[PDB]
Amino acid sequence: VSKESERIWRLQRARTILEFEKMLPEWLRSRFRMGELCKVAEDDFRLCLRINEVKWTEWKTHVSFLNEDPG
Amino acid sequence: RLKKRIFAAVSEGCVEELVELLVELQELCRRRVPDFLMHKLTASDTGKTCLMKALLNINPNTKEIVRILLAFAEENDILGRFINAEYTEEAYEGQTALNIAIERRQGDIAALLIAAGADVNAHAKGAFFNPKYQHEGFYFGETPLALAACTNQPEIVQLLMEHEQTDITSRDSRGNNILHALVTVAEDFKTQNDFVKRMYDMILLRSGNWELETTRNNDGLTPLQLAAKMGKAEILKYILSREIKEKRLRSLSRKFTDWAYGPVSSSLYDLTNVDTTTDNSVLEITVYNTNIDNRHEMLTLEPLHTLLHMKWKKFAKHMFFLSFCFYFFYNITLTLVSYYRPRLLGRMFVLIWAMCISVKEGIAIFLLSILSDAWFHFVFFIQAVLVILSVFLYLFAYKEYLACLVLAMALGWANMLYYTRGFQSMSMYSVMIQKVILHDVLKFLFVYIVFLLGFGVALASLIEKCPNKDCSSYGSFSDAVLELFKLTIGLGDLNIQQNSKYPILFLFLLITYVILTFVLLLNMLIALMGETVENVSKESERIWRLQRARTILEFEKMLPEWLRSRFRMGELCKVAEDDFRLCLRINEVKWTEWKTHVSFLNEDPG
Numbered sequence: 001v002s003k004e005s006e007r008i009w010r011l012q013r014a015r016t017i018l019e020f021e022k023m024l025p026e027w028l029r030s031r032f033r034m035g036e037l038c039k040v041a042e043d044d045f046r047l048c049l050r051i052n053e054v055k056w057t058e059w060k061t062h063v064s065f066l067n068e069d070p071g
Numbered sequence: 072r073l074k075k076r077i078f079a080a081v082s083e084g085c086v087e088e089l090v091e092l093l094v095e096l097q098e099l100c101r102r103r104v105p106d107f108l109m110h111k112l113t114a115s116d117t118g119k120t121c122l123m124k125a126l127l128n129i130n131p132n133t134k135e136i137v138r139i140l141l142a143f144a145e146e147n148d149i150l151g152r153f154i155n156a157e158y159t160e161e162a163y164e165g166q167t168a169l170n171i172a173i174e175r176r177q178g179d180i181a182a183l184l185i186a187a188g189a190d191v192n193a194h195a196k197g198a199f200f201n202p203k204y205q206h207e208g209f210y211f212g213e214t215p216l217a218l219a220a221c222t223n224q225p226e227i228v229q230l231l232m233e234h235e236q237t238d239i240t241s242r243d244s245r246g247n248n249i250l251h252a253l254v255t256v257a258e259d260f261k262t263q264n265d266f267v268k269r270m271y272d273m274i275l276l277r278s279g280n281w282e283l284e285t286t287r288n289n290d291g292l293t294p295l296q297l298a299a300k301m302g303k304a305e306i307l308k309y310i311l312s313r314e315i316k317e318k319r320l321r322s323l324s325r326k327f328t329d330w331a332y333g334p335v336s337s338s339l340y341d342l343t344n345v346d347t348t349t350d351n352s353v354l355e356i357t358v359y360n361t362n363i364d365n366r367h368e369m370l371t372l373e374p375l376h377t378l379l380h381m382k383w384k385k386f387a388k389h390m391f392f393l394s395f396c397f398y399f400f401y402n403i404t405l406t407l408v409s410y411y412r413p414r415l416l417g418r419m420f421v422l423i424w425a426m427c428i429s430v431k432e433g434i435a436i437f438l439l440s441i442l443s444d445a446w447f448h449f450v451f452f453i454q455a456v457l458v459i460l461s462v463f464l465y466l467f468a469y470k471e472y473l474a475c476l477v478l479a480m481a482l483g484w485a486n487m488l489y490y491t492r493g494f495q496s497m498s499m500y501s502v503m504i505q506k507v508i509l510h511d512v513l514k515f516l517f518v519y520i521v522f523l524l525g526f527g528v529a530l531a532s533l534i535e536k537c538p539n540k541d542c543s544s545y546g547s548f549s550d551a552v553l554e555l556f557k558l559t560i561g562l563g564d565l566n567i568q569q570n571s572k573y574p575i576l577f578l579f580l581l582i583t584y585v586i587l588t589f590v591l592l593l594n595m596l597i598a599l600m601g602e603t604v605e606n607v608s609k610e611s612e613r614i615w616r617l618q619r620a621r622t623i624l625e626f627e628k629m630l631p632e633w634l635r636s637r638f639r640m641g642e643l644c645k646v647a648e649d650d651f652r653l654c655l656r657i658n659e660v661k662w663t664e665w666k667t668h669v670s671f672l673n674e675d676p677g
């Protein structure tokens with residue numbers, strides 16, 4: 001139950017978040033609507049969500065980009 | 072629209088001919104001066120140049136790209152302020168192209184940029200490189216040497232230290248030099264393969280001198296005290312028991328074998344900033360810091376363990392037994408004064424010792440997590456306060472002194488735990504000082520008050536106003552709350568006759584309350600027990616060792632200066648040409664590592 005607690009809390013929170021998001025008026029949802037447009041290719045322009053993660057157990061090297069300039 | 076073209080041609084790298092033609096066009100536009108060229112060569116939003124964008128995007132043709140860029144920069148006498156350019160944004164301020172070349176593990180281009188004249192002291196003084204807390208940003212040391220050593224690039228660390236203008240004794244914004252940074256980044260037993268230990272040893276031997284290790288950051292900590300502050304058990308074990316076997320760097324060691332004959336070997340350990348004779352030593356920091364949860368493994372290191380054992384066996388055992396005896400006779404006198412209360416030999420030794428304890432523990436509190444280590448200070452102070460208050464109320468004409476006197480007697484017999492925590496019979500109390508006081512008892516109290524109030528209302532509501540014992544002990548809300556409390560205290564009795572219009576609903580709610588309070592109590596019970604008896608015995612032994620070290624250091628602070636100098640662990644030993652550092656001798660016998668003994672201070676053992 002140590003972990004089962006986290007399981008049940010996560011499930012209840014997800015269901016609560018989704019039903020609350022359903023309760024809002026459409027204009028409020030359009031106001032919140034996380035995710036920003038991003039050009040990915042010639043004409044792709046998809047709604048992307050930026051996720052800055054820190055994996056402090058890293059041993060590798062990264063060389064790729066879309067906007068190499070750190071945001 | 073040429074800036075974006077140069078940046079795209081330099082980031083994509085699909086062909087260097089694109090950037091070659093674009094640079095020809097740029098030079099043509101420049102002929103019709105340096106500030107214009109680099110304002111067209113940088114991004115005004117962050118300050119990044121095309122060199123950083125070329126190194127941030129490594130591709131199979133990036134070495135030729137940086138060669139082309141540096142050739143074009145030197146062909147215009149601008150390469151000085153172009154290879155040394157740095158970000159301007161608040162988050163990544165100070166980051167230059169050498170930081171990016173090292174963070175991308177590009178050694179060849181790094182040598183190229185250092186040969187071209189990129190200053191090797193560029194401090195990445197940004198809010199991303201100096202995070203407020205870890206896991207939000209990347210702190211390596213704000214320097215190319217620290218970045219090369221933290222990312223496990225000993226080739227670049229050699230390339231950086233063999234350079235001429237490098238500052239090995241450079242201190243970043245946090246005050247850290249390279250060694251504080253290495254201590255900060257060092258992870259664990261087998262997580263980072265102990266490469267930080269390798270870099271620490273290599274950088275300390277390269278610059279063989281005591282300045283890197285005797286340097287205090289902005290918190291007044293040296294790399295050794297910084298390994299003590301954090302829970303870096305591996306780096307602390309390395310620095311403390313560090314034996315250099317080279318002939319020139321022997322004075323850098325902190326441990327010196329001087330004695331080996333066969334398997335027998337008597338080794339000296341250095342106790343300069345370790346043996347509580349200074350401001351705050353590895354011993355003080357390791358014992359008193361309650362923010363690592365690793366003192367179990369750091370207090371068993373090579374000099375610290377024997378230092379604690381020696382202090383104990385030398386004076387702390389005697390002081391501890393003497394204080395236990397004094398408190399035991401204080402409690403016996405208190406018990407005999409409380410039993411023979413006047414409803415005569417000495418009833419003031421109680422009073423003088425109570426005032427002594429109150430002032431001592433009060434001064435102890437005044438100089439300060441603080442409910443687990445410094446817990447007994449509060450209860451000893453409260454007991455002494457109760458005693459002196461009982462005396463004051465007794466010499467006044469108060470008959471309410473007996474309550475405080477009996478409470479003080481009982482609380483003193485309870486405070487007798489502090490002396491008997493490592494006796495295997497007061498184990499559960501010693502560990503539930505930590506377990507139950509944290510949050511489970513307050514969660515239990517909140518839920519129990521909710522149960523009590525709700526069921527008090529639910530049961531008092533069900534009862535009918537009756538002509539004046541009312542046939543019901545669940546009368547007003549307070550009587551129902553009292554009956555319920557007495558119930559969970561095993562003081563009551565449930566009867567089916569309570570003068571209700573709904574006796575079955577009343578009985579249902581009463582039994583529901585009983586069962587719910589039992590569930591609550593049993594949750595708290597299995598929490599307080601949490602047996603795993605092997606692990607709970609580890610916990611009790613660990614608590615005993617931690618408090619033993621803590622009280623050893625407490626007792627060492629009470630002695631005067633002359634008694635401390637008369638105990639003074641550590642024999643003075645000459646370890647170099649003229650070093651003469653206080654050490655601590657430890658004899659060992661190893662029957663496995665058979666080696667010819669060429670490092671020693673004395674050739675004649677004994």
Ligand SMILES: COc1ncnc(OC)c1C(=O)Nc1nc(C(F)(F)F)c(-c2ccnc(C(C)(C)C#N)c2)s1
Nearest residue numbers: 450477478479480481482483484485486487488497500
């Ligand atoms: C080794 O222990 C002893 N040996 C011989 N005699 C003794 O007492 C005569 C004792 C002893 O522990 N006495 C105590 N006194 C008090 C005081 F409240 F008065 F402070 C105690 C106390 C304090 C706070 N919370 C509780 C709990 C949670 C248990 C409740 N309810 C109890 S406990």
Ligand SMILES: COc1ncnc(OC)c1C(=O)Nc1nc(C(F)(F)F)c(-c2ccnc(C(C)(C)C#N)c2)s1
Nearest residue numbers: 518520521522523524525526527528529580583586587
């Ligand atoms: C935080 O809890 C509270 N705080 C303040 N007041 C309270 O009640 C006054 C309470 C409380 O728990 N009330 C309750 N109501 C009812 C009910 F009759 F509705 F079923 C309870 C009940 C009765 C019988 N079997 C169960 C289960 C199925 C769980 C078992 N086994 C639950 S319990």
Ligand SMILES: COc1ncnc(OC)c1C(=O)Nc1nc(C(F)(F)F)c(-c2ccnc(C(C)(C)C#N)c2)s1
Nearest residue numbers: 558559560561562584585586587588589590591592593
């Ligand atoms: C209807 O009863 C209940 N309903 C719901 N919850 C409950 O408890 C959570 C209870 C209940 O009986 N509680 C109790 N408390 C205490 C106390 F320790 F405080 F004295 C109890 C007690 C009293 C006297 N001798 C003992 C022995 C020596 C047997 C022990 N051990 C225990 S009994």
Ligand SMILES: COc1ncnc(OC)c1C(=O)Nc1nc(C(F)(F)F)c(-c2ccnc(C(C)(C)C#N)c2)s1
Nearest residue numbers: 559560561582584585586587588589590591592593594
């Ligand atoms: C005063 O406490 C005692 N003193 C001396 N002897 C005792 O044993 C008889 C007792 C004692 O515990 N009596 C109890 N009866 C019951 C009941 F289930 F019937 F409600 C209890 C109960 C209530 C709620 N949740 C549990 C769980 C699920 C945790 C279990 N298991 C058990 S507890």
